[PDB]
Amino acid sequence: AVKLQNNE
Amino acid sequence: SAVKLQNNEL
Amino acid sequence: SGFRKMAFPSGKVEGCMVQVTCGTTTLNGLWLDDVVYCPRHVICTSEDMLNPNYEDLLIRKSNHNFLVQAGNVQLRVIGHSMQNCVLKLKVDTANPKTPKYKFVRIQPGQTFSVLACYNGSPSGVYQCAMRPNFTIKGSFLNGSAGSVGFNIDYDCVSFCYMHHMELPTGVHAGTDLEGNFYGPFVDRQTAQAAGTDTTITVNVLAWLYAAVINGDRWFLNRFTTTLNDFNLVAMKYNYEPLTQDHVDILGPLSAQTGIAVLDMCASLKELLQNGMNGRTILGSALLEDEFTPFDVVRQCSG
Amino acid sequence: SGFRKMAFPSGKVEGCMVQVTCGTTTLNGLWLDDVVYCPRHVICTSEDMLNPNYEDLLIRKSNHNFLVQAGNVQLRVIGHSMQNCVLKLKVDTANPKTPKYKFVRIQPGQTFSVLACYNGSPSGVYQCAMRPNFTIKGSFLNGSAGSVGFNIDYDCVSFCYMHHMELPTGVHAGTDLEGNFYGPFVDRQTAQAAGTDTTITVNVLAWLYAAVINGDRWFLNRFTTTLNDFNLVAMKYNYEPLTQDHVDILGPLSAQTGIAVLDMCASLKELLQNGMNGRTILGSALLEDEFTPFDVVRQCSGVTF
CATH class of the missing domain: 1.10.1840.10 (main proteinase (3clpro) structure, domain 3)
Structure with missing residues (x-):
């Protein structure tokens, strides 16, 4: 999948 | 060939 | 003699790296003068990352919703605006380590150094190229968004890339420092695919x-x-x-x-x-x- | 994901590089605290480099015979001595950009980041490995002597390499920061070959x-x-x-x-x-x-x- 590479 | 000490010259 | 994948020295960029947190979302930001640049999807929640309306998400935010850490000191956010896919956070302190810099948009084939960062701290530096399909083959994990690509020809840092996202094949996509994406990609987790990658x-x-x-x-x-x-x-x-x-x-x-x-x-x-x-x-x-x-x-x- | 040849961030090392000049010979120096480290062949003339007597070449030199420039600022040399193949130049100013550091000698096969430098100015960084034959497949030109290799162990910069010379095969050789050569080489412009290399x-x-x-x-x-x-x-x-x-x-x-x-x-x-x-x-x-x-x-x- 397409992943916006922020963190949580 | 020989080793080249890799300083620089002015 | 010898030939190596040579990056530029990263010190001028390290002193600009900060952490940006909005809610529980965090990524890296670039601190130049009194502006911190970061990818706008930091204002996204865990949900609403498929079709976010960034203009609507941003208007709901106050300046104090943006937590910016430069090392051990928290920067005070006194202003915020959006330029394309990038957020510009005005802070009340100009970065004393701000080097000579400029923003440049590059063409496919161009190379640059990447300072990969997490939580505003540098992990490492490596060399990359803008592929013809407008991706880059980076080394990026979750939290690396906000890492930048740059060249330091002469004494001026030319920022050319800000990292945003990873594509399903493991290649990466991002924007110039004006927030305009390279290629047709968008900062949404909707299904996207890089075109056939060709050799430069x-x-x-x-x-x-x-x-x-x-x-x-x-x-x-x-x-x-x-x-x-x-x-x-x-x-x-x-x-x-x-x-x-x-x-x-x-x-x-x-x-x-x-x-x-x-x-x-x-x-x-x-x-x-x-x-x-x-x-x-x-x-x-x-x-x-x-x-x-x-x-x-x-x-x-x- | 992705996997790249990844060097350490070089910011802490960049602030330590200086230029060292002795006569017409120029190279790079590492300014740590109030001492500058650099290759001892900086005291060689172009004609001295075949079979130099570093013991004898240094005796004739005094403190002010070494020109140390940190950017546009010239550092005053208040002492000098030689430890193995490196020269230590005591200066009257401690480097205010001194990071937490230590000198470590690495084993063959271990990796490090090279900060290639010219005229005391950092120009590039790349990752490489100490080959089993103790050479380094680096990228170095004239004036790159004094460039350093390093690792970052937790919060501490571990300097492990200082560059000296290029072998006729185009690979490179140097010392640790205490002046001890890696590999069976000596700092003089003679024919020198390394042992056969192996894969790590x-x-x-x-x-x-x-x-x-x-x-x-x-x-x-x-x-x-x-x-x-x-x-x-x-x-x-x-x-x-x-x-x-x-x-x-x-x-x-x-x-x-x-x-x-x-x-x-x-x-x-x-x-x-x-x-x-x-x-x-x-x-x-x-x-x-x-x-x-x-x-x-x-x-x-x-x-x-």
Whole structure:
């Protein structure tokens, strides 16, 4: 999948 | 060939 | 002698790296003067990352919703605005380590150094190229968004890339420092796919010149070729077409080694046909395409 | 995801590089606290470099015979001495950009980041490995002497290399920061050849683990081997012997991918005998040996400094 590479 | 000490010259 | 994937020294960029947190979302930001630049999807929640309305998500935020950490000190956010896919957070303190800099949008084939960062701290530095399909083959994990790509020719940092996202094949996509994406990608987790990746032909030829400069000639041949015949061959190996402008770019390297550009193009045609037959070129068994003619001249002659 | 030749951030080292001049000879120096370290052949003239007597060349020199420039500021030399092949120049100003550091000598096969420098100005950074024959396959031109290699261990810069010279084969040789040469070389412009080089087996295995983490799995197989059986064919292909220590340090990668260390050796064994069969691993058609096990861990888990 397409992943916006922020963190949580 | 020989080793080249890799300083620089002015 | 020698030829290495050489990045620029990262110190000027390290002093600009900060952490940006909005809610429970965090990534890196770039602190230049009194503005912190970061990807706008930091204002997204865990949900609402498929079709976010960034304009609507941003208007709901106050300045104190943005937590910016520069090392041990929290920066006070006194202003916020959105330019394309990038957030610009105005802070009440200009970064004292702000170097001479400028923003530059690059073309496919161009190389740059990447300072990969997490939580505003640097993890490492490596060299990258803008692929013809407008992705980069980076090394990026969750939290790396906000990491930048740059060159430091002379004494000015040229910021050319801000990292945003990873595509399903593991390649990466991002924007210039004005927030405009490279390629047709968007900062949403909707299904996207990079086009067929092709080889940067002019970069391969530059790398072959670097080999010759370093004393390696085994791959040459006595042949030449027309520009059109080379391109008809190159396309069959998924190589980018070689334009007259590329030919002109390789002129200096052609002049330094005494090998005409079209002669070296004939060499490349044979290498694609033969492979390397247990041999290497500059320590590689593939044809390296992430060194530009400018990179070769900078590393080989100074 | 992705896997790149990744150097350490170089900011803390950049603030320590200076230029050292002695006569017409120029090179780079490392300014730490109130001492500047640099290669001792800076006291050589162009005609002195064939068979120099560094003992004798230094006796005739005094403190002000060394020009140390930190940018546009000239540092005042208040002392000088020689330790093995490096020169120590005491200055009257402690480097205010001095990071937390220590000098460490690395083993053959260990990696480090090189900060290539010219005229005391940092110009580029790249990752490389101390080859088993104690050479470095670097990228260096005239004036690069004094450039340093380093690692960052937690919060501390570990200086492990200072560059001196280029061998006729185009590979490079240097010392640790205490002046001791890596490898059977001496600092003079004579014919010098290195021993036969070998592949760093533990590093190749680490790199194969990095590939599996990135989804490259075609080289895996049902087979396993033993240390004795693997080392028999490893020695035959000019590979470094694999020890129980290498197996141990590979443990974290073996458990995280679910692939036993000796299962992976069977993969590497088959790759040496049959090649890659036209395929690539992590974008390479060669067996890469310039990534240590810790190099893979720090990149794939995103360790910061």
